[PDB]
């Protein structure tokens, strides 16, 4: 229940503001910057600000703070969701999120902000629906928003009905300094870029553990996602009733389902770090990377980031496979490998000097994170069974899907 | 299917070698379609197995069934889930409609000896579906 949502700038200047209720004065935005500065200098800065009896919730955007001032006890989650929807709409309409597009599309930006929400209650949130009624280069509102199906616009015609899916896998491993993995969770991502004619109702079907158990086929390899979230077009009633993923696919790229469950398998890449750091004399980087993934899968663009000393200089890299580059801005050395086949063993020996004068304050021990990404690999083993594409007119669809395996929160605690 | 015919003798030999009673990851062939075996495809596979032999009368085992399913998936891309047996005790009908192969006793359900037997009426009569309507949805 934010009183007015406004877009700030890096210097505190409000790029654009639009009051929705009028219960909060527009002059409260100026005091938001000093409050944020005071909070940052004292560690009390939070996204949801508080200026007396009015709370100024702000979100750190690409270049400006989306401050949404509120007066009463409005829904904080609702305000955050509205801010996220506005950010997504701006990203869809404008490819750049900065001051360049804030002051360049003000005529259409004001109209979009007015149409999005009224009296603090959002009304329009579909990017396609918003673009079909408000454009930067006006007709009546589309019937899709008024109709029940607000995620599949009718009347879409295409020469060919091709849908491109993406089985995105995020391998996150939280390995402590003792060598044991604490947080090992893999989050699935079933995103399909449906581009066909009409408004077909997708019938999602995969090798789900629950579905296999219900059907009596709980004997093969089935993916058991701990948390499964359906898309907006996905009907939750069918999923609750008999796990039937039946929904109208959207026009374009959209996320249908996103699995999220813990992983009890060994890490795809096993990285062991050795720190032979002398007392203000030299530093040793005994980094050894072991590929725990299948040999048939290659980790393309593998970048194992090893944090080097903050004041370290004149470093020497002695590795076997993969180029090692030290970035002064990042204050770490990343063991970048173009191709990392499964089972590969890469050993590196870093050696660099240190300044004679000791550091005044400690710099910490940031965890070592790798950027391994091996496509065409299904670590979870979940295989899509079928995709029920049904259209009233009747057409032969040719959906496609690709499985991509990458490294997410795969951070190893430093010694 | 020349590839299927070639793989049938090796699959039969592997099943016979395995008694009746190391690499991690899930690699996937690029561009290879994956889908469950159809009723017509299951019937054709059962007919081919019956003609070539090595499937009817063979002692049913978990290892042999898994090897056969893996060979079928390698040869045609069919998921190794349609070659399921009906719940016991007794003769287990094919899990997928259209399958011409079924497991029947040859003498706890696990300790009972089962043998794969050809069933032409299985492809036309949904015995497994009728026995377990809930499992059929």
């Amino acid at each position: 229940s934010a009183s007015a949502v406004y877009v700030l700038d890096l210097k505190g200047k409000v790029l654009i503001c639009r009051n929705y209720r009028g219960d909060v004065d527009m002059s409260e935005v100026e005091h938001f910057m000093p409050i944020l500065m005071e909070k940052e200098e004292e560690g009390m800065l939070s996204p949801i600000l508080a200026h007396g009896g009015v709370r100024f919730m702000w979100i750190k955007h690409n270049n400006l703070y989306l401050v949404a001032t509120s007066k009463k006890n409005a829904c904080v989650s609702l305000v955050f969701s509205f801010l996220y929807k506005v950010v997504q709409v701006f990203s869809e309409y404008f490819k750049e999120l900065e001051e360049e597009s804030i002051r360049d599309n003000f005529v259409i930006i004001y109209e979009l902000l007015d149409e999005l929400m009224d009296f603090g209650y959002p009304q329009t949130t579909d990017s396609k629906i918003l673009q079909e009624y408000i454009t930067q280069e006006a007709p009546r509102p589309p019937a899709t928003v008024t109709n029940a199906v607000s995620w599949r616009s009718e009347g879409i015609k295409y020469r060919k009905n091709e849908v491109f899916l993406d089985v995105i896998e995020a391998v996150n491993l939280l390995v402590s300094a003792n060598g044991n993995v604490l947080r090992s969770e893999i989050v699935g991502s079933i995103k399909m870029r449906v581009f066909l004619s009409g408004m077909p109702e997708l019938r999602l079907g995969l090798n789900d553990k629950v579905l296999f158990d219900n059907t009596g086929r709980g004997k093969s390899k089935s993916v058991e996602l701990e948390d499964v979230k359906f898309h907006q077009c996905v009907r939750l009633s069918r999923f609750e009733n008999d796990r039937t993923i039946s929904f109208i696919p959207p026009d374009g790229e959209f996320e249908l389902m996103s699995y999220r469950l813990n992983t009890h398998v060994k890490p795809l890449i096993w990285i062991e770090s050795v720190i032979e750091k002398h007392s203000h004399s030299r530093i040793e980087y005994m980094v050894k990377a072991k590929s725990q993934f299948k040999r048939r899968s290659t980790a393309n663009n593998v970048e194992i980031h090893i944090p080097v000393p903050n004041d370290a200089d004149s470093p020497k890299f002695k590795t076997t496979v993969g180029s090692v580059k030290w970035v002064p801005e990042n204050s770490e050395i990343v063991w970048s490998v173009k191709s990392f086949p499964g089972g590969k063993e890469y050993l590196m020996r870093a050696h660099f000097g240190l300044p004679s004068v000791e550091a005044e304050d400690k710099e910490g021990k940031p965890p070592i994170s790798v950027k391994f990404e091996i496509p065409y690999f299904t670590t979870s083993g979940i295989q899509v069974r079928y995709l029920k594409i049904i259209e009233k007119s009747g057409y032969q669809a040719l959906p496609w899907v690709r499985y991509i395996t990458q490294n997410g929160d795969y951070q190893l605690r430093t010694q | 299917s020349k590839s299927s015919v070639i793989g049938w003798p090796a699959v039969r030999e592997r099943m016979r070698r395995a008694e009746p009673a190391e690499e991690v990851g899930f690699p996937v062939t690029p561009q290879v379609p994956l889908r469950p075996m159809t009723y017509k495809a299951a019937v054709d596979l059962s007919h081919f197995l019956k003609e070539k032999g090595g499937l009817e009368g063979l002692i049913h085992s978990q290892r042999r069934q898994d090897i056969l399913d893996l060979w079928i998936y390698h040869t045609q891309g069919y998921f190794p889930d349609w070659q399921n047996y009906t719940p016991g005790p007794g003769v287990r009908y094919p899990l997928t409609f259209g399958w011409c192969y079924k497991l029947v006793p040859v003498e706890d359900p696990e300790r009972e000896v089962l043998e794969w037997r050809f069933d032409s009426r299985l492809a036309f009569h949904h015995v497994a579906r009728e026995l377990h309507p809930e499992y059929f949805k």
């Binding site: 899907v401 395996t405 | 379609p33 889908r35 349609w82 997928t96």
Partner: peptide, 18 residues
């Protein structure tokens, strides 16, 4: 070709489930 896994054809439903 495409990085991250080549696109593969998908079926319509589980043919073995009737």
């Amino acid at each position: 070709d495409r990085k991250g896994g080549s696109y593969s054809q998908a079926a319509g439903s589980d043919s073995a489930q009737s």
